[PDB]
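DM between two lab members

TW: hey, do you still have the beta-lactamase TEM entry open?
JB: yeah, one sec
JB: this one, 263 aa:
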Amino acid sequence: HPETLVKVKDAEDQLGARVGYIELDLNSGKILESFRPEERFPMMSTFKVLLCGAVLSRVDAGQEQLGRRIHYSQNDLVEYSPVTEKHLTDGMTVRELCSAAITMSDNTAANLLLTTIGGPKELTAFLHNMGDHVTRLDRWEPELNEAIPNDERDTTTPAAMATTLRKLLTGELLTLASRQQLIDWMEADKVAGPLLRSALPAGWFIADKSGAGERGSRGIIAALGPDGKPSRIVVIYTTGSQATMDERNRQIAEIGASLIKHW
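TW: and the structure you got?
JB:
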């Protein structure tokens, strides 16, 4: 609805930065509303959903096992690894790593998982292979969060990301069991509380993944809907603002409040 663009445009004014937005019908793929849909923005941790999607594609094809155990050490640890920094001794399985990367945004978990699929290059090949000729991952954590102005490395567009998430959660791309595993990890997301979840009505469903990077970058991708089932995908990205994390979180929550009001 047009009133939600009023809020998105307002968000841009208050943040003094570009805001990209898209609302997509999950079932039909129809773009319901958008703002700067094809402009590039840093994915930050939102890429971890795509990473585990590629991992699950490997599992389905008999190339990976969710129960497989990965051993790592102190050397592997990078900034913000709340789950992985606690399992140095006995390691963690592929399943526990996707859980950590998605629900807690654990950077080391993401790096270990990228390593299993062949690095950023292979995640990008996976994406191109499923029809996303836009999204690209070029670096590892934490450098992928640099958000250098005009740099296309590690970026996506709201349209590209929304379409890709739709395919991952409803397409024949992944088996039914994997599709649901990916959704379950997003539903259990624990570090997106002040974003869309703070605007979600009781009884509504939400599976999401947020992200934060340098130079004011912030964003969130989500599948949400009334009565416990998702029915639309929402993607919100911004970069370039000098605003505080709280101010950035509030703008996203208000865009969320608006799209829920005009559902």
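TW: got it. The chain has eight helices and nine strands. The domain at 1-263 is CATH 3.40.710.10 (Beta-lactamase).
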